[PDB]
Amino acid sequence: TRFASVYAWNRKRISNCVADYSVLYNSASFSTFKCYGVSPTKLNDLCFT
Amino acid sequence: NVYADSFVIRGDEVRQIAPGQTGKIADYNYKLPDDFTGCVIAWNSNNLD
Numbered sequence: 001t002r003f004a005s006v007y008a009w010n011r012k013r014i015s016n017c018v019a020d021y022s023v024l025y026n027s028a029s030f031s032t033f034k035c036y037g038v039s040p041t042k043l044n045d046l047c048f049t
Numbered sequence: 050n051v052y053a054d055s056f057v058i059r060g061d062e063v064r065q066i067a068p069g070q071t072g073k074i075a076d077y078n079y080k081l082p083d084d085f086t087g088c089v090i091a092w093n094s095n096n097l098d
Contacts, residue, residue, distance in 0.1 A: 025073045029059075031061045033064075039069070040069065040070065040071040041069060041071060043071075
């Protein structure tokens, strides 16, 4: 619905779920995407903490 | 051994034409090798399509 302001941002914790990002192909269209310390093609075989 | 390929895609999906990328265009439609040798060219054609 609504987002926050730059000078006072937000933080949320995620846990105990399975990450399948193929569900975003239908609607979302992103103009920027960059990852540091990992490779985009290796994101389907790892587990995150 | 020169060759040329041609097709039409959306606006913000031109960042996926490069080795080592993920998305709906680099997964099901068109993929590039890892040891590539060539050039990539694109331009805007809003007035003709």
